[PDB]
Amino acid sequence: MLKKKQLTVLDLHPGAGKTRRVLPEIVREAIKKRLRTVILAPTRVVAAEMEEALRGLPVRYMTTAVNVTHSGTEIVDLMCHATFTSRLLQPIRVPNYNLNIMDEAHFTDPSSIAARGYISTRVEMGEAAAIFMTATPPGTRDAFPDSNSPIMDTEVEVPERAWSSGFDWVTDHSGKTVWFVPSVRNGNEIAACLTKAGKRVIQLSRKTFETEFQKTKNQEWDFVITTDISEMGANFKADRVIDSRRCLKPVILDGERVILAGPMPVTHASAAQRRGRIGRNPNKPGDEYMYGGGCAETDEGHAHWLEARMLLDNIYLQDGLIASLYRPEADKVAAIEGEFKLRTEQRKTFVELMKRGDLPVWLAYQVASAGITYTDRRWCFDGTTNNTIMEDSVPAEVWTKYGEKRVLKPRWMDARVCSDHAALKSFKEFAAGKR
């Protein structure tokens, strides 16, 4: 496994112990063999759980999710997927990792896809070894994999709106339920209905995940309402998953705008991970998985794979060579390797628009490749009339950095900057020059 030129997919079923049992064995072996190693966690929550599994072992934690005093002698680095790719985009000396370990390696956010592409390319070049840990590798077709204890699988109509009758089984349940919704806004409406019905609800999404996930440990709850972020190794003490089996898909239309298409079916991988939240306790058989639709391979044509190519085109590898996407996910996007390579100053703008600007990759690329500098926000206001962003059914307005009240009307429209109240608030702050 640890030998150079080898990429290993550790595809044990969900809950089989990849993170708590196998990972520490690999790390002890890597240290014995003096292999410089990186461990990539999908989330800060997983990074902290890895610290518990790896406690005692000399690991440098490159995350403020862990409070450790390092020795400076560690040859094993641990960071989130996004941090790895983020540092690769910056003028930062990159250690030669002989061994590259990615946990929850099914994660489809652009920076995770890019990290797999960089790593697998280095393995293909004979420069390194890699281990990708996931029950659901790219292209998996089995939504119902093995579990630690038997699961009751039931195809059932699942509400996606508030309801007054017809779904008694949802609220008649006395255990804890994890409910996967297609979007934050959808989750808000279901959560309000459950709260009105007397349930205690916690809501999880990408921007709130680390903070809100702690509440699943610190307080009593009946329902966790979550987007697909909880597919990435989030552990709950639950006995039921309700799965809409739906997600939103960012889709680039006519190379000029990004829409959030759907809700549409999840992939088999996603469905298996959603289901995989339960059936984890061999002493508690009969956890329930209620699913409200079929699976489809909706990662095909999904903007994240094009965005991953934008990131990798702007990461140095060797001379003019450019890292390929990991082979099993390399034909998901029509994309020409190298087509998004930016010159020095535009590439720095691109990085800053993602890092400080917090803009989606695709949108950051449009701005940077247009030769616009980071602090120049005129593009947020000079788009066509159908790019007007709406707030409470009237055009959203901000005061520009010049002190002028203007309608938010970006030259490039990416629906992710206004998909919920929090997103729009952050984009308004950006348009105003506030970061």
Of 87 and 207, nearer to ligand M0J (C-beta) is 87
SS3 288: strand
Q: Is 328 labelled as part of a ligand binding site? A: no
What CA–CA distance (Å, rounded) separates 394 from 402?
Answer: 23
Q: Is 16 labelled as part of a ligand binding site? A: yes
Of 64 and 386, nearer to ligand M0J (C-beta) is 64
Of 209 and 236, nearer to ligand M0J (C-beta) is 209
Half-sphere exposure of 152 (CA within 13 A, CB side): 10
Dump the DSSP string for 397-418: EEE-TTS-EEE---SSEEGGGG
Q: How far is the CB of 209 from ligand M0J (least distance, A)?
A: 15
How distant, in Å, are the alpha carbons of 142, 206, 234, 276 from that of 272? 7, 20, 14, 6
Residue 362 CA, chain-centre distance (Å), reads 16
Q: How far is the CB of 82 from ligand M0J (least distance, A)?
A: 8
Residue 318's beta-bridge partner residues? 321
Residues 72-91 touching ligand M0J, rule: CB under 6 A, are 77, 83-84, 87-88
Decide if residue 174 touches ligand M0J (CB under 6 A).
no
CA angle at 233 for the pair 227 and 239, rounded to the nearest 5°: 75
Q: Is 24 labelled as part of a ligand binding site? A: no
Half-sphere exposure of 275 (CA within 13 A, CB side): 31
Decide if residue 94 touches ligand M0J (CB under 6 A).
yes
Of 87 and 341, nearer to ligand M0J (C-beta) is 87
Decide if residue 64 touches ligand M0J (CB under 6 A).
yes
Of 86 and 270, nearer to ligand M0J (C-beta) is 86
| Number of residue whose CB is nearest ligand M0J | 87
Half-sphere exposure of 240 (CA within 13 A, CB side): 18
Residues 31-60 touching ligand M0J, rule: CB under 6 A, are 60
> Residues 7, 40, 50, 62: which binds ligand M0J (CB under 6 A)?
62
Residue positions forming the annotated binding site for ATP: 12-19
Which positions touch ligand M0J (CB under 6 A)? Answer: 60, 62-64, 77, 83-84, 87-88, 92, 94-95
